[PDB]
Amino acid sequence: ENAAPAQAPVSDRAWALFRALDGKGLVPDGYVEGWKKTFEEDFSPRRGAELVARAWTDPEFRQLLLTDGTAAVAQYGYLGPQGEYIVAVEDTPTLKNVIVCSLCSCTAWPILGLPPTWYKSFEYRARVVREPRKVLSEMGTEIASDIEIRVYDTTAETRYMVLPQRPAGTEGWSQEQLQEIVTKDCLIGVAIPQVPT
Amino acid sequence: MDGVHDLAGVQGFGKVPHTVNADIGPTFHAEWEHLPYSLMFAGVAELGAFSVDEVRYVVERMEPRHYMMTPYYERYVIGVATLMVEKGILTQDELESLAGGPFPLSRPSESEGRPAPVETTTFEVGQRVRVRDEYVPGHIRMPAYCRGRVGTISHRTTEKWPFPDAIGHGRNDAGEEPTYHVKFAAEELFGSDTDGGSVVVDLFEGYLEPAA
Ligand SMILES: [C-]#[N+]C1CCCCC1
Ligand SMILES: [Fe+3]
Ligand SMILES: [Mg+2]
Numbered sequence A: 001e002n003a004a005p006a007q008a009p010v011s012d013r014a015w016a017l018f019r020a021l022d023g024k025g026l027v028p029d030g031y032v033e034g035w036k037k038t039f040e041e042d043f044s045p046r047r048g049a050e051l052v053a054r055a056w057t058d059p060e061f062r063q064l065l066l067t068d069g070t071a072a073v074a075q076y077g078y079l080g081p082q083g084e085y086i087v088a089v090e091d092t093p094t095l096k097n098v099i100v101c102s103l104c105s106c107t108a109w110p111i112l113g114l115p116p117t118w119y120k121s122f123e124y125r126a127r128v129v130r131e132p133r134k135v136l137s138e139m140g141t142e143i144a145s146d147i148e149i150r151v152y153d154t155t156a157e158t159r160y161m162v163l164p165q166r167p168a169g170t171e172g173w174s175q176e177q178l179q180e181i182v183t184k185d186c187l188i189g190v191a192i193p194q195v196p197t
Numbered sequence B: 001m002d003g004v005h006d007l008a009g010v011q012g013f014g015k016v017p018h019t020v021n022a023d024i025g026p027t028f029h030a031e032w033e034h035l036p037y038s039l040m041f042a043g044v045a046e047l048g049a050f051s052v053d054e055v056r057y058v059v060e061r062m063e064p065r066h067y068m069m070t071p072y073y074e075r076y077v078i079g080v081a082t083l084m085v086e087k088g089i090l091t092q093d094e095l096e097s098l099a100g101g102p103f104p105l106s107r108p109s110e111s112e113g114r115p116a117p118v119e120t121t122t123f124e125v126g127q128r129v130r131v132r133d134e135y136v137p138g139h140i141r142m143p144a145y146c147r148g149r150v151g152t153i154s155h156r157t158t159e160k161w162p163f164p165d166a167i168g169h170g171r172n173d174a175g176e177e178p179t180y181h182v183k184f185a186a187e188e189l190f191g192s193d194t195d196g197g198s199v200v201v202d203l204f205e206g207y208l209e210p211a212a
């Protein structure tokens, strides 16, 4: 009849899993709490934004980021779980890059933060590979016909970040000012950095 | 595994539930949500009970309707619990006792997996490759939309990793392979029924063969 299986509340199941393992001495003191900290506070798109602003103002670093992303990210100490082999992909006047994991949620955690709910949605996972122009449009980003859209499906160990184009009107801005306009969505590739009116 | 999790290219879904730069709220929206990832790492790094690939596979092994109605983080609670049971660390009985009710798990594997391929080719940037026309019932890191399709190498990784089709089943014969960024024209994957330009899939060497 296609009905859902009977299940205890998800919180009860999740904590049961914790307690089953913890009660057997299999989870070190403060282990899950430490990970929660890392996930909430350390893994952050602010790190990716910092990398973008550096690339925008330092041609040498830009070239390193684009040829050996791992080494570039390592200079900042931002390698980590789900972010050990980094490739940065360069937007150009004729190319817009977008990242997905069609098979589950694969994301460069340490520099983009854990993926947002929408990125893990079946809608995004199904659609962006096939109709990225329409998906971005619906999300609020218009990509003209003369720009090729390239979708990177994160199917193995490469962990991606988008290096967006530096928008006009930011000439002479400090790294701090530039960082501010590089958002999580810019790093994923669904948004273009915005300059205030 | 040709499961419902292989969603790329599926038609009929509605809008992505987001507009750019909208507030996505806190990292975790419920007090339990950090547990799946944290206990996965406990399993991998502390217990050595399973691989990360085995976690992807056990989630692929959710009964299909169960997968389709289960929120993301809950799929990983189910997957990690399933692995703990399969590896003999926990019993389903004690999970259900502690949970105070039913805790259905992923379905048993119907494949033992497969070894890292014996004969592969080192490809170079710019080379034309075809994705091997193969069907793998166990874990595989090849979305079906690219099976049998032709593309161009844009990158060969400078590192190598265990073949997912083996390590995703905890086998001893995963070896190591680099992966390749393979660029496909949108029309190669979806004919006229796409609005995109290109799609780059990160494919293990063992999934590829020279074109022609
Ligand atoms: C748990 N878990 C998912 C986390 C990222 C790697 C694949 C599995
Ligand atoms: Fe994923
Ligand atoms: Mg490792």
Ligand SMILES: [Mg+2]
Pocket (backbone or CB within 6 Å): A171
């Ligand atoms: Mg300039």
Ligand SMILES: [Mg+2]
Pocket (backbone or CB within 6 Å): A172, A173, A174
């Ligand atoms: Mg100034």
Ligand SMILES: [Mg+2]
Pocket (backbone or CB within 6 Å): B002, B003, B006, B144
């Ligand atoms: Mg399929």
